Amino acid sequence: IPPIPPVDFAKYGEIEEVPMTRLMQIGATNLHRSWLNVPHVTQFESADITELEAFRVAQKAVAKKAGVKLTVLPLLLKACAYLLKELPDFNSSLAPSGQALIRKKYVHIGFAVDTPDGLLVPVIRNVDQKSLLQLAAEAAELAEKARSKKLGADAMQGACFTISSLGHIGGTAFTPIVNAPEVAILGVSKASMQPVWDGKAFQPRLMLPLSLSYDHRVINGAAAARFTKRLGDLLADIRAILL
Amino acid sequence: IPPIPPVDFAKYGEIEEVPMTRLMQIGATNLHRSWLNVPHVTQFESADITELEAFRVAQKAVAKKAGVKLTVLPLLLKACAYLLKELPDFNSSLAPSGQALIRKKYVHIGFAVDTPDGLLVPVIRNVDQKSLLQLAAEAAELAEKARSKKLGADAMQGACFTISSLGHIGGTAFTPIVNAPEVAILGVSKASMQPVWDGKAFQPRLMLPLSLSYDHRVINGAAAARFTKRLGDLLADIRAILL
Numbered sequence: 001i002p003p004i005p006p007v008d009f010a011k012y013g014e015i016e017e018v019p020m021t022r023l024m025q026i027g028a029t030n031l032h033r034s035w036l037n038v039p040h041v042t043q044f045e046s047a048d049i050t051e052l053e054a055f056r057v058a059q060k061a062v063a064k065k066a067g068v069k070l071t072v073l074p075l076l077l078k079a080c081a082y083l084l085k086e087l088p089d090f091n092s093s094l095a096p097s098g099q100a101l102i103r104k105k106y107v108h109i110g111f112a113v114d115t116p117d118g119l120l121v122p123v124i125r126n127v128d129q130k131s132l133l134q135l136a137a138e139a140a141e142l143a144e145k146a147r148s149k150k151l152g153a154d155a156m157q158g159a160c161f162t163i164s165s166l167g168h169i170g171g172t173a174f175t176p177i178v179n180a181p182e183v184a185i186l187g188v189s190k191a192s193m194q195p196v197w198d199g200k201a202f203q204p205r206l207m208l209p210l211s212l213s214y215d216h217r218v219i220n221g222a223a224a225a226r227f228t229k230r231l232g233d234l235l236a237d238i239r240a241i242l243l
Numbered sequence: 244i245p246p247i248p249p250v251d252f253a254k255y256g257e258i259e260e261v262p263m264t265r266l267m268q269i270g271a272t273n274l275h276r277s278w279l280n281v282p283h284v285t286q287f288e289s290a291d292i293t294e295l296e297a298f299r300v301a302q303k304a305v306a307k308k309a310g311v312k313l314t315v316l317p318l319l320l321k322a323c324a325y326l327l328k329e330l331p332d333f334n335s336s337l338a339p340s341g342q343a344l345i346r347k348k349y350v351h352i353g354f355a356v357d358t359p360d361g362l363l364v365p366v367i368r369n370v371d372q373k374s375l376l377q378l379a380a381e382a383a384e385l386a387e388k389a390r391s392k393k394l395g396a397d398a399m400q401g402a403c404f405t406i407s408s409l410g411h412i413g414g415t416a417f418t419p420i421v422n423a424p425e426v427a428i429l430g431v432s433k434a435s436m437q438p439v440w441d442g443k444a445f446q447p448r449l450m451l452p453l454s455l456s457y458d459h460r461v462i463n464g465a466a467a468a469r470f471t472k473r474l475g476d477l478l479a480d481i482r483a484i485l486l
Contacts, residue, residue: 055482062486070486078485132486239298239482242321243305243313243375 001036023118034180041221042175043212045228047235049191050206055238068136072188072208073111076163077135079234080186081107081127082241084161087227091160093181094218101218110159110179111139113146120146121179123159167191173211183218184227187211208235244279266361277423284464285418286455288471290478292434293449298481311379315431315451316354319406320378322477323429324350324370325484327404330470334403336424337461344461353402353422354382356389363389364422366402410434416454426461427470430454451478 009015020028049072056070063070084091084107092103107128110121122142127135145151162185164176169190176187189209195202212228219227234240252258263271292315299313306313327334327350335346350371353364365385370378388394405428407419412433419430432452438445455471462470477483 055480058480059483059486062483237298237301238485240302240305241485242481243302 021117023115023120027118030179031177034177038178038180039216040175040178040213041216041224043214043221043224043228044173044210045212045225045232046194046207046209047232048196048205049208049235052235052238053191053206063133063136066133066137068133068140070132070136071139072167073139073163073165074132074135075235075238076165076186076188077109077111077124077127077139078132078241079231079238080109080161080163082234083227083230084109085128086230087223089219089223090184090214090227092218093183094215104160106160108159110156110162112162112164113143115147117149120151120156121159121162122146122151122155123157161185163188167208171209173209175211176213178213178215180215184212184214184224186231187213264360266358266363270361273422274420277420281421281423282459283418283421283456284459284467286457286464286467286471287416287453288455288468288475289437289450289452290475291439291448292451292478295478295481296434296449306376306379309376309380311376311383313375313379314382315410316382316406316408317375317378318478318481319408319429319431320352320354320367320370320382321375321484322474322481323352323404323406325477326470326473327352328371329473330466332462332466333427333457333470335461336426337458347403349403351402353399353405355405355407356386358390360392363394363399364402364405365389365394365398366400404428406431410451414452416452418454419456421456421458423458427455427457427467429474430456 052072052075056072056075059070088103089101091107092101095102106126108123108125109127110123113120113122122145124130124135124138124142130138142151142155145155159179159182161182162179164185165188166174167188167190171189173189174187176185178185187210189211191206191208193204194207196205196207210228210231212224214224295315295318299315299318302313331346332344334350335344338345349369351366351368352370353366356363356365365388367373367378367381367385373381385394385398388398402422402425404425405422407428408431409417410431410433414432416432417430419428421428430453432454434449434451436447437450439448439450453471453474455467457467
C-alpha cells in the first residue's frame with residue numbers, strides 16, 4: 001500500500017511535535033487494520049423515541065433510588081441485545097478460513113468511551129440477561145474505570161457488537177468503523193424534534209439518528225436495512241421486547 | 244360446626260335431584276376447607292389499562308403469526324410474576340407448625356378455567372421466565388386440555404398464586420376464595436371506560452377492576468394495598484417490568 005510522501009511542514013510556518021499515547025497508536029493500528037480489511041457500508045435510519053424519552057424521564061425517581069442515572073444507553077443496549085438474538089448474522093464473525101461464519105450464542109456488547117489517553121471499548125457481558133437498571137449501573141462503572149485507567153484488559157474482550165454514542169456532543173449522523181472481527185457497530189447521534197407526517201399533518205416527534213456500519217462481506221444491504229428498521233420499531237415501543 | 248337442618252323441599256313444589264360430578268364435590272370440599280381455615284380480607288383496586296389495551300391490539304399481527312391469541316391474561320401473569328418476586332410474602336405459605344412461612348423461590352401461577360364438570364386450575368411453571376407470547380400459548384393449551392379432560396393432575400400442582408379472570412362475562416368486582424395453602428388470589432373483572440380526574444377535567448381511561456383476597460394471618464392490610472397499588476402501576480406501564 002503506497003505510503004504518503006513526507007512533506008517538510010516547517011517550510012510553511014512554525015510546527016511543534018506532540019507525541020502519541022501508546023493507546024492512540026494501538027487505536028490507530030486497529031482502525032487501519034479494520035479499514036483495509038472490511039468493505040464498509042453505512043445504513044442510516046432514525047427512530048421515534050418520544051415515548052422512550054418520556055419513559056426515561058418518568059423513571060428518574062426509581063433510577064436515583066437505585067444510584068444509577070437512567071440514560072438512553074441501557075435502553076439501546078437492551079434493544080440491540082434482543083435484536084442480535086433475532087438476526088444472528090449480526091452477532092457473528094467471519095472464520096479465518098474466509099468460508100464460514102462463527103455464530104456466537106452469547107451477546108456481549110461494548111461501547112465507546114473516549115478518554116484522555118484514547119478510545120476504550122469496555123464490554124458488558126450477556127446484555128440479554130440484564131435489566132435496564134443493572135445495565136445502567138455497569139455501563140457507568142466501566143466508564144469511570146475506563147477514564148481512570150483502572151479497566152483491566154479482560155473487560156475489553158470478546159464483544160459481539162459495538163455501540164458508539166455521540167448524542168451527547170451533537171451531529172446528525174456519522175459513518176463509524178467496524179471493530180473487526182465484529183461485523184457491525186451502531187453509531188447514535190443527537191436527537192431532535194422533527195415533523196413527521198401523521199397521514200394528515202406534521203406532528204413533532206423526537207427522533208434519534210442511527211448509523212449502522214457493517215461488513216458488507218457478511219451482511220448484505222437488505223439484512224442491514226431490516227436490522228435498523230426493526231431497531232427503529234423496538235425503540236419506538238420497547239414493550240415489544242416483552243413478547 | 245353445626246349443620247344445616249334438613250328441609251323437605253318437595254312440600255313447597257316439584258323438585259328434581261341432579262347429582263354432582265366428582266370434580267364439583269372435590270371443588271366443594273377444598274373451598275370449604277379454605278373458608279374455615281383462612282381469615283379472608285379482599286382488597287379492591289382498579290388499574291389503568293388504556294395503554295396496555297392499545298399495546299395488546301397493536302400486537303395482534305405478531306400474535307397471529309405466532310398462532311397465540313394475545314389476551315390480557317399473559318399480561319396479568321407477567322406483572323404478577325414480577326411482583327411476586329418484589330413482595331415475597333405473597334409468594335409463600337404458612338408452615339404447618341403455624342410459626343413459620345415457607346418462602347418459595349420459584350413463581351408458578353395457576354388460573355381458573357371453568358369447565359362443564361367443574362373448576363380446574365392449571366398451573367404455568369416459572370412464569371417469571373417466560374415471555375408474553377410463550378405465556379399466551381401455554382395458557383391457551385392448558386385451557387383446552389382442561390376443557391377436554393386431558394389435563395394430567397401433575398399440572399394442577401404446586402402453584403404459588405391464582406388469578407381468576409371473569410372479565411369476559413362481566414361484573415364489577417368479586418371476593419374470590421384463597422386456594423389454601425396459597426396465600427392470595429387475584430380476581431379480575433370487566434374493564435370499563437371511566438372518567439378519571441387529570442388535575443383539571445375528567446378524561447376517559449379504560450379501567451380494569453382487581454380484587455385481591457388474602458390470608459390475613461400472613462398478609463396484613465398495608466402489605467396487600469401496596470401489592471394492588473404496585474400492580475395497578477405495573478399494568479398502567481408494563482415497561483416498568485423492564486427495569
